[PDB]
């Protein structure tokens, strides 16, 4: 399952830590969790 | 056909939530060469 979603500048207290914030409706379209790793990619 | 990277889930910023945003630092921008505004495909790993 994949979805599209616009890029946003992290939190400075994120930057470095290899993670991406997305909602919890996001989360559910996507089958993830908190702590589950997901692959993205440039949208042409 | 662009690169990949993989990444780490993690919960929104409240304001953020139902905006369909996705918020990732500076390198990882560059990893993919996006700039805030653009759009990324997201698909689960696991």
Known sequence: SSVELR???AYPED???GIVRMDK???AKL???VGD???VKKVD
Request: glycine share 14%.
């Open 37 to 39: 790793y997901v692959e």
């Open 25 to 27: 409706q996001t989360r």
């Open 7 to 9: 890029v946003a500048e």
């Open 31 to 33: 089958g993830v969790s």
């Open 15 to 17: 930057v470095g830590r």
